[PDB]
Structure formats: C-alpha cells, structure tokens
Write a protein that binds this ligand. Structure first.
Ligand SMILES: CCCCCCCC(=O)SCCNC(=O)CCNC(=O)[C@H](O)C(C)(C)COP(=O)(O)OP(=O)(O)OC[C@H]1O[C@@H](n2cnc3c(N)ncnc32)[C@H](O)[C@@H]1OP(=O)(O)O
Ligand SMILES: NC(=O)c1ccc[n+]([C@@H]2O[C@H](COP(=O)([O-])OP(=O)(O)OC[C@H]3O[C@@H](n4cnc5c(N)ncnc54)[C@H](OP(=O)(O)O)[C@@H]3O)[C@@H](O)[C@H]2O)c1
Ligand SMILES: NC(=O)c1ccc[n+]([C@@H]2O[C@H](COP(=O)([O-])OP(=O)(O)OC[C@H]3O[C@@H](n4cnc5c(N)ncnc54)[C@H](OP(=O)(O)O)[C@@H]3O)[C@@H](O)[C@H]2O)c1
Ligand SMILES: NC(=O)c1ccc[n+]([C@@H]2O[C@H](COP(=O)([O-])OP(=O)(O)OC[C@H]3O[C@@H](n4cnc5c(N)ncnc54)[C@H](OP(=O)(O)O)[C@@H]3O)[C@@H](O)[C@H]2O)c1
Ligand SMILES: NC(=O)c1ccc[n+]([C@@H]2O[C@H](COP(=O)([O-])OP(=O)(O)OC[C@H]3O[C@@H](n4cnc5c(N)ncnc54)[C@H](OP(=O)(O)O)[C@@H]3O)[C@@H](O)[C@H]2O)c1
Lengths: 445, 445, 444, 444
C-alpha cells in the first residue's frame, strides 16, 4: 500500500501520516470456528490452525497506536494460541470485549496473534502522547488498563491486564499491530527490525522475574538456576543474570541447547539427562527429592552454592526439583508451566527452609523500559536465532512448538528482508553484529 | 445551568448527558497577572490573590472526565498557590503546557485551584472507561501520564506526574473540575459531598507515607511521631497509625490542636511548647540535638520507645529533630516543608543509626484506592472540621493559611448546602455521623 | 529442690544462684529406644511414647540460659515428635550434635520436648548478657547460630537454625529448659506463666507470616484468609490481622472451631465442611478450581474482595485452593502442611495472577520481640484454651494430636497451680482476665 | 613470641594451641590521657597521638576469637579516633564498658585501633563454633550483640552494634585482635594478607549501601553517582556498581583521583573542582541548585540519565547536590559526612521527586559474607594502593588524614613482609596480581 511503501521507504513522519491506512492488512491469525479442531489430537500442529490472510483494519482507540509491524517473533503463547491451549484465545477475546467500549473490537472471528514486535508508528489515537508516525518502536505485550488503580502500583497487576496478541486481538504477527500507547518503547536504534522484535516479551518477562523488584530481584553474586535455558525466556534470563553479576546455571536438554547457552556466556550448564529427569518425574515424590538433591549437589559443584533463584517456566516436571534445589530462603520464580501447570512440590522444602515461589507474568511498562535500556546499551542482546518471513510464520511457530529453536525465532512482517531498521549503525558497529547475534544460525536439531 | 440542575436534582445518566455543558463555570482561581503581587510582602493574604468568577470551560481530553464538583477542600497547596509560593503555579501550568497536545489547555491566564473534590461525572472523554455521567466520585490529585513507563511501576513516579489544581489547571475549587480518569474513585457512599471531598489529597498522601509499601510502611506496634498532627495530613496520619495497630504520638502546638488529635483518638500528645520548639531551633544544631533528645525521651515516656516512623511535613524547623528522634533504623517520611524547605540535619544520626528519610508525594491511583477502601469501610473517617461555600473559599483558604483550622476545611462547590450526597444512609447510620465527623466544630483557636 | 523452691518462692537472684542446680530434672521426654514402637501402628498414640521422669541436667553452654520452666505448651511439633514422625526427633538431635562442641549434648537417648515456655532464669552461661537469675522470661523456639552470617540478615535463615525442643534437646516441657540467650524475651508481666508460655512458637510464627517484613507483611485493609483458624497458629493470626487493621476470614471445619475464632473477634467465618473439603479434593484439579472459586466468592461476599493474604499451614488439602483464592498479586504464606506436604496447585493461578507463595518457619528473635511487644501492650492476647499440669502433658499432647483443642494447650511445668507469675496485676486487671483468655475452656 | 612464630611458620592447629598467648602484644593505640592534646590545635596530626607499643593481652570472652593479625588497613575512623574527633573514642569505650560483664575489658587507658584485618585464628572462646587456631580469616568491623533481637533482623541494627577498634578496644592495627566470632569470615584464599585486610570495612560498607537489600539495592542498569570515588569506600562502590551491571559515575577532586577510579574501570568521571564545590556551597542554596543542575547534566551527558543512586559520604558540601541530582524516586545512600555532618538540602527536591535518603553504616555479618564471596570469586578486587608496616602505621594514618591516598592503605601487622598468606596461588594467577591490585602505587 502507499502506507507500507512510505514506511518501508523511510518516508517522513508527515508523509507516513499522509499515506492512508489500508482497510485490511495481512495477518497471521486464528479463526474462531477452528477452536475445537484439535479435540483428541496428540500433536496439535499449529500449521493446521494458523492462517495468513487479510483481516479488517480496526478503528484505533484514542489511547492506541497503529504500528506498521516490521518484524515480530514467535512466542510460546503464539504456539499455545495456535493450539487453542489451555483455553482458546477467542474465550479471552470475548472476555476482553465484555468490557464494552473500545474493548469490543477484540472479539472477532479472527484472532491476529503476535505478542511483541518492532515497527514504525503510522497512526496515533487522539489521546496518545509523544509518539509520532515514523517513530521506530518496539511493542511489549502488556496491554493494560491505566484507569485501574492496580496499574499504578504495578502495570502487570490490574484485573484488565492482558497479553497483546493473546488476550487481545490485533497482535504483532501481521503487517500492522494495534497497541495501547503504554505498550510502546523506542526501538533500540542499533538493532535490526527482527533483532528488536524478538526481545520485548521474553526479555521483559525474564527481566521482571530476575531483575525487577517485582520478581526474585537478583543481586550480583546470586546463583540463578535457569530451566529450559536455551529458549526465549532462558536466553534473556542468562543475560540478565550475567549482566547483573549473577552466576547462571543453565539447565538444557541437549548438547545443541548447551551450545546455545554457552554462546550466551553461560558456562555452567547442567544437562537434564545427567540427572535422568524425565516427564514422569513429577508423579514420583521420592525421585523428585533424590533428583532435587542431586541437582542441588550439581549446582553446588558448578556454582559453589545451591541456587539463590530458580528460574521456572518448564512447569510440573521441574517444579518439584526447583522447590528442593533453591537455597534456604531462596526464590523459585515462575512464569509458566510448559510441561504442565499442575505443579506438585514438597512443602516441607518451602516452609522449613523459608523459600519463596514468586509467580510472575510478563512485565509492566516500567520493567519493559528498564529491559529496553539494557538493550539500548548493548548490555543485553537479542536472542534471535532464526528469521522467517511472515509468509512462513506458521512454520516458525511450528519450529518453536517442536522445540527445534534456541533463543528467539523472529518473523519479518512488513520488513521485506533481513537486516533493515538499523538507525544507529555506528553503535551497532561498536557492539558488533556478532555480539548482537550470539544465537545466529543455532538450532536445537 | 441545566447541567448543574440535573446533577443537583440527581438526574439519570441520560439526562445528565442531554444537559449541555456550560461554556463557562464558576471557579476559585488565580490570575497570571497577579503572580508578583506579593513581592516583598510578609503576610501574603491568599484572599488578595484568590478570585471567584466564570472561567472558560475547557475541551475535554479523551482520557479526561468532567466532574460537576459538589465539594472540594482547602489544601495547603491551595494556600501555596494563592501565595505564588514557592513558585507561581503559572510556571507549572506553562511547563505542563510545553508537552503540547492536550496539555496546552492548562496554560491559561487563570488558574483554577483545588486538588481534591467529590462530585458527579457529567462527561467522559472517548477514551474513558467505565465511568459514566451521574457516577459519584472523589477526585484525588495524582494527575499522571499513563504512557510513561515509570507510571506503571508507581503512578507517582512519572516525570509528568502533577498535582491536580496545582501543576494542572481545572482544579476542584469550582463548580466543575477536569480530571484524568485515573484521578477518579467511587465516592464513599455513606459520606456527604464535603466529607468525601476533604480526604483524597491529605489522606492519600498520609496513606502513601505510612501505610503503603511506597512510604515508611508502618506495621502494627510501630510508634509514629506525627508532626503538625491536628492538620489535614496529621488528622489522617493519626487514623492510619491507629487503624494500622500503630501508636501515634501527635505533636501539636496548641491545646485546641491537642483537643483535635485526641478527638481522632490520638491520646499520646506532645505539645511542642512543652519542648520549647521555636522556629529558630533549626539554625541551632546543639539545641536541635538537646531538644531531639528531649523529644525522644518524651516519646519513650508516652509510647514506650523512640518513634519508628516520624511523619514529617512541618519542615526545616522540625526536620533536624525528626532525624534525631527516630529510632535506630527508623524512617523519617516527609511530604512537605511548611516551615521552610531548606532542611538541616545532623547526618551522624542518619547514617550511624541507619535511619532513612523517605521523600513522599501525593499517592498513586493504587494507594488512593486503598485509601478509599479504608474510608469505604469506615476504618478511617473524614477529618472535616469546617465547611465553607465556594463563595467563601478565599476565607476558607485564609483559615488554613493562618492555621486556624484543625483537620480539613471543606468547600462546597456546586453542593447548595451541607449534608448532601449520602447515597448509603444505612452505612452512614451504622458508622454514625459523629464517628464520621470527629473534628466537627473544632478549630485551632 | 532448693532451686525450684527458690524459684517458686520468688527468691532473690543471689538466693537462686546459691541454690544448686539439680543433677536431674523432671521432663516430658521421648526415649530413643522407643523410636520404632509405632512401626505398623496406625494410631501413634503419643501417650504411649511420652515419658515423664528425671533426665540428666546438661552442662550449660556459655551462650545458654537455664530456665526454671513455669509453664510450656503443646505444639504441633510436640505431637509429631511423640509420634516419631516423619523422622524420630533423635535424627535431628544427632544431626545437631554432629556440629560438635556444645551441640554434642543434644544427642541423647532421651529427648526433652517443649518448644516454648515461660519461666524464671536460674543460671546464665558466662557469655550471656543482661539476663540474671530471677528474670521472668519467655522462650521462643528459634535456636539459632549467631555466628552464621545468614543469622545476621534473618535469624531464621541460618543453616543451623533449629526448633527448640524439636531439633534440640532440653525443651520446655520440663521443670527446666536449656535455651540460647537469643531465645529469651522478658515475659509479659501481666500474664500468668501458662498464658505467657502458650504464645511464643505459634504467635511468633503467625507474626512472621503476617506482620513481619519477612512474611506476607500485611497492611491495614488487607483481607487475610486464615486456614485452620481456631488452632494455635490461627488464634494468633486472627489477632495480628485484626490488630493490624486487616480483615480476617477464618476457615474452620466445625461449629466449635467457629465459636473459638469468633471468641477471638473473627466475625467473618467460612466453614470448610460447608465447602466439601476432603483429603481427595487436592487430587481433583477441577474440584479444587470450582471449590476455590466458591471459596473466593464466599470471601468476596464476606470481606468484600478476595483475600490479599492466605494464611496456610493446613497443607495439601487446602493449598491448591489457597493459590486460587488469593487475589491477583496476593500472597499465600505457609508454615506447614498438616494435611500432607505434597502440595498440588495449578500454577496458572500463580503466575498468571502474579501471586506469591511465601514459605515461613518460626520467627527470628526480632520478630519474637515484636510479637512479645504486642503481648506486652495487650494488643494481642494468649490463645490459651486449656491448662494441664506437667503430670498430664501426655494427655495434653493427645488432645492436640487428636485435634480436640482450639487455641493453645498450656502445660504447667514447675508452676504448682494456674494463675501465678503475674507481676503487673494492674495492667492485667486493666486488660481483663477474660480479655486475656478468650478461648478459656473451649474445645474442638 | 612462640605464638607469632607458630603463626608465621604456618604451624598446625595443635602447635598454635600449644604456643602460649603473650601477656602483652604490639598495638597501634591511643592513650586516654592524650584525649585533650589537640585542644586549640587546628591540624590534629595523628602521628602525635598514635602510639605503637605493648598493650596487655585481654582475656578472651567465650564468643570471642583471638586473631594473630597479619595485616590491617587505615580507615577514616582510625584517623578520626587518632584526632579524638568528634568525640574521643575512649568515651565510646566507657559507654561500651557500661554494659558490664565482658564489655568492661574495652574500658582501658589505651585504645587499640584498627577496624578490619586479615589474620590467623589462634585462640577461640569456649562458645565459639567452627573456627580453629590456624584458620585464615578476615575480620569485619561489625561488633554486634547477637542476643539483641534487632541483630536477628539485621546485624547492623542492634543498640550494641559497635565498630571494632573504634567503639571497641582490641582492634586490628596490632599483632593481635580480639573479635567476636560473628566478625569472622574466611580470608579469600587467593589474596595476600594485606590485600585481604584492606577490604572488609570499606567494601562491606559499600556493599551494604549499594548491593544489599539493606541499602540502595542497585540493580543492573542503575547509574550510581559515587562521591569521593577514589577513596576506600569509592573504590569498592565503583566495583560493586560495575559488577552489578550498574553504571558508575565517579566524582573525584583531582586528575590523580581520576586515574585511580579509571584504574578500577570507572569510565565516567566528573571532576569536582570544575563544578566549583567549596565548604560554603552547601551554605548557598541557589548555588547548590545551579551546581546540582550542572552535575545532573554532567551525569546525563556521561551516563544517559540522572543517577538512580547517589553514593554519599562526603557529607555536607555534596549532600544538597546529592539530593538534587538523584533521579526522581532515586536514592541517596549515605554512610558518612567527611566534609561535615550538618547537612543542608532543599526538601522540595526530596519529597516532590519522591527521593530517599538511606542512612547506612557498616555491614552486617551476612552482607560481609556476601561481600567476601565477591572477593572469593574475584568479582571484586582489593583497593590496596599502599602498604605500610605497623612500625609506620602512624604515617599511613597521616597519609589518609591528609587525603594523600587513593583506595586503601594496608598496614602489615604480624606479616613480616608483603605477598604472604596466599593459600590459593592458582586462583591468584588466574585472576592476576595486577588485576587484584588496580590501585598499586597510586596516590592522590
Ligand atoms: C499527586 C501529588 C499531590 C500533591 C499534593 C499536595 C502537595 C503539596 O502541598 S506540596 C507543596 C507545594 N509546594 C512546593 O514547594 C512544590 C513546588 N515546586 C517546586 O518548588 C519545584 O518545582 C521543585 C523545587 C520541586 C523543582 O524545581 P526544578 O526542577 O529545579 O525547576 P522548576 O520547577 O522549573 O522551578 C524553578 C523555575 O521556576 C521559575 N520561577 C521561580 N520563581 C519564580 C517566580 N517568582 N516567578 C516566575 N517563575 C519563577 C524559574 O523559571 C525557575 O528556574 P530558574 O532556576 O532559572 O530560576
Ligand atoms: N509472561 C509470561 O508469563 C511468559 C513469558 C514468556 C514465556 N512464558 C511461558 O514460559 C515458557 C517458556 O517460553 P519461552 O519463550 O522461553 O519458550 P521456548 O523458546 O520454547 O523455550 C522453552 C524452553 O523450555 C524447554 N521446553 C520447551 N518446550 C517445553 C515443553 N513443551 N515442556 C517443558 N519444557 C519445554 C526447552 O528447554 P529444554 O529442552 O532445555 O528443557 C525450551 O528451550 C512457555 O510456556 C511460555 O508460554 C511465560
Ligand atoms: N503530597 C504532598 O506532598 C503533600 C500533601 C498534603 C500536604 N503537603 C504539605 O504538607 C504540609 C501540611 O499540609 P496539611 O494539609 O497537613 O496542612 P494543614 O492542614 O495546615 O496542617 C499543617 C499542620 O502543620 C502545622 N503548621 C501549620 N502551618 C505551618 C507552617 N506555616 N509552618 C510549619 N508548620 C505549620 C500545624 O500544626 P502545629 O501548629 O501543631 O505545628 C498544622 O496543623 C503543607 O506544607 C502541604 O503543602 C504535601
Ligand atoms: N514455625 C513453623 O513452621 C510452624 C509453627 C507452628 C505451627 N506450624 C505448623 O502449622 C500447622 C498448624 O499448627 P498449630 O499449632 O495451629 O496446630 P493446631 O493448634 O492443631 O491448629 C491447626 C488447625 O489446622 C487444622 N488441622 C489440624 N490438623 C489438621 C490436619 N491433619 N489436616 C488439615 N488440617 C488440620 C485445624 O483447623 P480446622 O479442622 O478448620 O481445620 C486446627 O485447628 C502444623 O503443621 C504445625 O506444625 C508450623
Ligand atoms: N560504615 C560506615 O559508616 C563507614 C564506613 C567507611 C567509611 N565511612 C565514612 O565515609 C567517609 C569516607 O571514608 P573512606 O575510607 O572512602 O575514606 P577515604 O579513603 O579518605 O576516601 C574519602 C574520599 O572522600 C573525599 N574526601 C576526603 N575527605 C573529605 C572531606 N573532608 N570533605 C569532602 N570530601 C572528602 C576524597 O575524595 P575527593 O575525590 O572527593 O575530594 C576521598 O577520596 C569517611 O567520613 C568515613 O568516616 C563510613
């Protein structure tokens, strides 16, 4: 379109504003009628549910910004949505729309997925401040209600807090995304679109979990055991732990995943097999205890002490272990349950050793700015390992679904090719393209 | 006007929306032309600056709500405003307006003061959720930018955080107020307009300082020394301390003010003449130490220990004392400097005894809701001691200026008479009108 | 003995020092040779394992205080001790003793139980400061190693932190207790021995869980769901919640337990049976969710919102519910698992709603002082519901074992009768005997 | 003596035990009679007050450890005490002794100074655990009362918290030191005595101020403005800031002090002199504001934003600036007032911007362990810039008195030369001697 062309041409703020908004846009999406298609299905192949096609351009709310999405990423929630698990997102869209007003737009027979992105502002609602068409932005997933009192204590805490592209429509896996202005941050200038896009959700989430005073709040010298360490969350977890003067201990399930975490500077790596952790471990209290003890011993061996923080998200199969291995007074911080949300743990290890389990979710706008600042300095780098064109986003999603990736799989959206969007090439040169892409071309194959 | 009649008649939502917004409204305001009128003037009589007259109705921003203000209150900032101290509010209005967009409205040759209020929603911007015309609200003063990341960590912390009616125009000492939706809370139903109006600013502020995890965060058993205890802040500080299971020790300068704090159930009272505190004490390090020591001894006598938290706002005169008197590891929490902001203190007492000074300001929307909840249950009650019509708001202001009040001086705005706006009379009856007005009829003389 | 006679007669410090320490003392204790007596026994009747008789007086460590124990209390760990479950306490005693030095004394074939007490200092180790014979004290259970760096961040957090009389010997269900001076606090002067003795462990634990910045750290206005609310822990929880301007909502399993919590001024009460809780709800995730929702709904109806803090200790059966019922950003604070330590919960409710589970154990010396200060002002009162003489402490223990109690079962030790040890009768009279004993005579 | 010989020879624990404790030992000390010796003297030259000679070996308390002090360091309190400023330390010794019991020993007509050290345990009181003669230790200054409840919440917060060798006698600027066992941590093995010795007081203090949850509690990304940055405190502050992934901005008064901070990898430096700071700036409110603004801008230029934490200790001259420059919601953490304790600041800057001033002092045993762990891993290195023998400790003290130093001036005590005490040479070599001594030979 004239708008996409203007965006892609690096046209001026005024020219971008002057290019009309298309009536439809290309979006990776789910269809409400398919929400039952995986009933009984063992391998709920996201490529079967994901559609790519034109969806209606919605009306922009006054506090919203239309972003020409240059790139986005696959997040696990993209996978979960495409799997209609644990609940089809359409149920969330309907709950969202039940607020009425502007919220109603979310309830659509399609759901445009994508929960972070980088791109270019093309329109702002009349209540949007500062942002101008042409502005290079990243969008983080915290779609929150700033009228809620809770939001002003913690952006993540409001009852209306939602994840963009998951509990909201108009996500980032599309040529355009509709975001609340409080989802917007300036794109790190030295990064490409795809590099910038891969971070907000996972890095912000890891940031809240580990760095922010809203999570485990690591300090230098903390040993952080990081489960599923080579993945999206883990790839950032590692960096925050290292950057904060912590000692990460990566738990990975393969040599390739080990390679990935080492590329991120995590030299202390535990392979799940050297502990014979298998999925049925969670049903076996004694084995959990025995393996937790062994795991603790290993962490002690590698890092010098039991972990201060255990970075959880792998869920039920590891959670028992996590509770056990954390040092007395330690914190298990969890933001997920990939292996199952029904967690079982021995409470004696929690109360008797005064441990904490901190439930964490996404990151508020402040945490996301903090995260962004760490990218802006090059302290933290994108965990991008692969890039797919939007045309192949279902496959990108599948890759994540099948755990064939390390780090983050980026999806070019409107960006016609890789390597665009660097507006501070000197800084990029100073940090180094390689330093910025530790995971380039690595897989979990 | 038809709109004010509709509001006063308790009209339906539709009737209120159908009633046109007046082009102008009655407002207590200052005039930009008067900013220097107190140059080299000792007693800057607020009544010489305060104007009451029609001001233009501004256009409502999309995130704003037009409130038909039923009652408001004099706050000290109203006094500071009318004195053009320490800096004329017009400078703030201009700084505010420099943001552009909707902010430019704030820059006017008039400044409508008033930093809290209760009233009725009459219009909402297209970006406002949930509120509707007819809704009974209180407005608290935290006029914040919800797009700023900092806001999502703490609503008070954004660089665009302003105090309604002080760094913003369209304050509550008028028949209408323009507020951001995130300034709105449901008015405690059992309260009259004037009762509801007196609390948000002072109570929220005291709440942040003492109750909130963002201030000194009292716990039951804490002894809290409360300076200027019979005033707006102290009158709530006392209640939060008591309600928190803390032990308030009121410092007052007079028997009338002691009576005021006793009526709030603060039975540990220190008259500052009993200490021989005079305004020049601050210039005299030795006398501050001696007196601080006497003060500490007195708190020990009355409350059993040195205060855990010193509730400051009286400023330079008391601050050195506040630092000395606080227990080891204690917190001086301060939100003001009525006696002068150039604080001097002996840092030995601060670092050697590992004390903290917590600067606090207003309250974020979360804290304000928490505050409101305590009013809602009747745990905390309005500190209203006097009510003036808007016609006499200048005098009301002068009263506070001349420290002739205890608690809070309410100002009826649109409310034509006292006692209106109780929409939960049963609750009111249960709590008791007298419990709700401990300070009724009390003065500082 | 002349020492016990000196203590009971309120003799001077000099006189107490001149009265020799007896070589043995009367103690409720277990014998290591009984550790196996309940193998294959379903009802591990504590009256069968608990012995009362003379045990050797140990040599006082330099940082220790010999307390003539006027009164103690039954604690849940006392029961578990007497059941030798899940591990005979002797395992903990030997583990303690493996530290060597003074710790070796704890490794004995007898274990004097008792994890709190009130009494009179009779001897101090040469490294004890300030405490003197004749001093009226309470003992709290935090037997900690003050050389450990962790102890100086949080007394509860050292690896050598132990529960007095559970992982240490010379507990307070005896006429004498051997404590570290960092277990000692001045006895609230207006309380009788038994009243003062019932509180340290449970009140301190509840304090840490709810009031302290080491626990959930309630604020006024917080709604606190209190599981097992009529018990030792619950009876103090209710009171700290109330005292701190919180809104307690007690969960109790019966009418009698409801009566107990209301006696403590907890007017919001949910009955567990009301809601169908059995030991297999935990195993039914859909039931936990549906029952949690109902519980949440019931709290919203009662308190106006979902609980800000859930005070857990009941364990597996309620824990899944706890995680569900807590508000967004809410805290489940847990110090035990009465119904089973294998907790199952739906982590979606934890992470998606940014809730926290805070594990808490005991209370450090600071928290215990803060707890004690709340007893000293009368802001919080003892939860004493019953008093047994030491002779009948096995019965008292069986009562707790069989959940026949509410609040705290006190045990007179050296105190020859109830009602002694009040040294501030004026404050006692001011507060009110009944005020101080809201649970007097109540049972489950 | 046979003891010192046994220690320098690395004798077995049993050998160290068999060697008698001398009745006296070599100590850098003050004499009570001299307390008045600088009445009307403007330059209170510490070389005139500091004595080096034999002092009586005190009797060890049960919780105490006698350390063969190998190396110590000059601290500013050493200087202050040698000046008898602001109060002669003897006053604190008498206050300390007023506790009675073991505290009485501290009231002597001599005061042995030295507030940190590295050395070899040679005797332990009967209540001391774990430590054994021969053990290589560092001593940190937190001489605290572990019976005080406060200590169990924070070792620094007890009423009886004292600075070893300042408010206690038997400090470390001597061949032996008497320390409570809760002052002891294992000496980082890869360090020499003097390297190990220079850190505990300054690094632990900086740690508490910056890293600990008891201070400003920096996180990565934080910009930390560090006043007096080349000094003892600053030298560690810079390192904790960098190590925590923070961004330090040093303020130094000179090109040399700048060289020092850059040696510690502080890239961003603001010269104080350029800003115009004089001891009457604080007295000029307008100047403080304009100067604070230029400072803020300087920080913004260098680091990208106003500082998140202002690391204070320079006191009254800088403090008003500190309050001004700190970001909105930022923290000024202060542990001293070198330029004067009468601080003046514009409170509008504090409350209106919701800033905090956190008073900090020393570091509890936990923070000191944590600090020690960062030395153990090599994450933080000693700030030793100079070494004096104990013979020359007065001069070392004078060097610090006259701000001629950068980092930490170490004093060898029983160590007969530099370079001794490395018991993990492999780690030493991996880290690097130069790495471990960034300030070697530097001055101000
Ligand atoms: C949600 C919060 C609720 C708050 C509830 C209630 C709060 C209270 O009651 S607090 C009491 C209100 N009183 C106060 O003193 C707060 C007023 N604010 C201030 O003093 C300042 O903004 C302060 C100190 C916080 C920060 O100042 P700072 O960031 O350095 O600059 P700024 O705000 O622009 O103020 C100084 C500028 O004002 C201008 N100014 C100063 N005096 C005057 C004057 N007489 N006329 C015109 N302009 C003036 C000048 O341009 C000056 O700049 P310069 O340095 O060249 O002289
Ligand atoms: N804000 C939030 O609450 C938030 C944010 C991001 C992610 N999450 C949740 O956190 C989890 C991880 O997300 P992510 O982006 O890091 O995903 P990811 O890139 O796929 O990485 C997950 C890592 O965990 C392990 N893993 C992968 N699939 C798993 C499975 N099905 N079961 C158990 N372990 C598995 C793998 O490591 P090993 O093979 O080494 O075990 C993988 O490297 C997901 O469930 C996600 O939905 C939550
Ligand atoms: N959010 C904030 O930062 C915030 C919010 C509210 C108020 N404040 C500031 O807090 C201060 C008190 O506000 P308030 O509403 O409590 O005012 P108030 O109702 O007038 O009460 C102030 C009390 O302080 C003492 N006092 C009065 N005038 C004083 C003066 N000129 N100098 C020193 N002490 C004086 C009086 O007690 P004695 O006569 O017993 O000493 C009076 O009771 C003001 O400076 C206000 O601007 C700040
Ligand atoms: N420092 C610590 O970590 C610490 C300190 C004190 C206690 N605790 C633990 O906290 C729990 C409560 O002890 P506390 O003295 O209150 O004991 P308690 O006096 O017996 O009170 C426990 C309450 O919880 C319920 N309960 C009792 N037995 C139960 C069971 N087997 N399963 C489920 N619920 C049960 C009962 O309430 P209703 O039947 O409604 O439910 C009872 O009133 C125990 O696990 C104890 O070991 C831990
Ligand atoms: N635990 C505690 O409370 C604790 C612990 C250690 C130290 N302290 C206090 O912290 C302060 C610094 O001690 P530290 O060993 O860094 O001392 P230091 O090695 O002398 O370093 C002090 C730095 O502060 C500056 N300075 C020195 N004298 C000054 C003065 N009179 N006025 C203003 N600035 C001055 C110098 O920096 P230049 O670049 O600025 O001008 C010097 O490099 C002392 O007052 C000490 O008593 C307190």
């Amino acid at each position: 379109s004239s708008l996409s062309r203007a965006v892609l041409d690096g046209a001026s703020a005024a020219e971008i504003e002057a290019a009309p908004v298309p009536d439809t846009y290309l979006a990776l999406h789910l269809r409400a009628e398919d929400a039952d298609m995986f009933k009984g299905v063992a391998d709920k192949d996201v490529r079967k549910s994901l559609r790519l096609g034109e969806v209606p351009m919605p009306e922009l709310a006054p506090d919203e910004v239309l972003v020409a999405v240059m790139a986005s990423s696959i997040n696990y929630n993209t996978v979960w949505s495409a799997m209609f698990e644990p609940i089809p997102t359409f149920h969330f869209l309907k709950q969202n729309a039940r607020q009425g007003g502007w919220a109603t737009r979310h309830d659509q027979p399609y759901h445009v997925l994508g929960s972070d992105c980088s791109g270019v502002v093309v329109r702002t609602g009349i209540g949007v401040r500062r942002w101008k068409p042409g502005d290079h932005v990243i969008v983080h997933p915290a779609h929150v209600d700033e009228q809620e009192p809770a939001t002003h204590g913690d952006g993540m805490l409001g009852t209306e807090q939602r994840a963009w592209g998951f509990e909201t429509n108009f996500g980032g896996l599309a040529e355009y995304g509709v975001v609340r202005a409080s989802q917007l941050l300036p794109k790190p200038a030295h990064l490409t679109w795809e590099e910038a896009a891969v971070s907000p959700l996972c890095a912000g989430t890891a940031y809240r979990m580990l760095v922010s005073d809203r999570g485990a709040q690591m300090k230098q010298g903390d040993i952080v055991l990081i489960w599923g360490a080579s993945g999206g969350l883990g790839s950032y977890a590692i960096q925050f732990v290292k950057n904060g003067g912590g000692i990460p201990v990566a738990v990975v399930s393969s040599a390739q995943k080990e390679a990935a975490v080492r590329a991120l500077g995590c030299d202390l790596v535990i392979n799940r097999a050297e502990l014979g952790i298998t999925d049925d471990i969670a049903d076996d209290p004694r084995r959990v205890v025995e393996t937790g003890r062994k795991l603790a011993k290993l962490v002690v061996e590698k890092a010098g002490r039991e972990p201060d923080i255990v970075f959880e998200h792998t869920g039920r199969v590891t959670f028992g272990l996590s509770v056990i291995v954390a040092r007395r007074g330690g914190t298990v911080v969890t933001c997920g349950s990939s292996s199952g949300y029904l967690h079982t743990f021995d409470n004696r290890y929690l109360w008797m050793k005064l441990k904490k389990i901190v439930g964490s979710h996404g990151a508020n706008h402040e945490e996301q700015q903090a995260t962004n600042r760490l990218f802006e300095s090059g302290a933290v780098v994108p965990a991008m390992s692969a890039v797919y064109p939007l045309a192949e986003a279902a496959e990108a999603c599948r890759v994540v679904q099948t755990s064939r990736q390390v780090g983050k799989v980026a999806v070019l959206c409107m960006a016609p090719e890789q390597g665009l969007g660097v507006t501070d090439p000197d800084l990029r040169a100073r940090l180094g393209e390689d330093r910025l892409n530790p995971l380039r071309g690595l897989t979990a194959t």
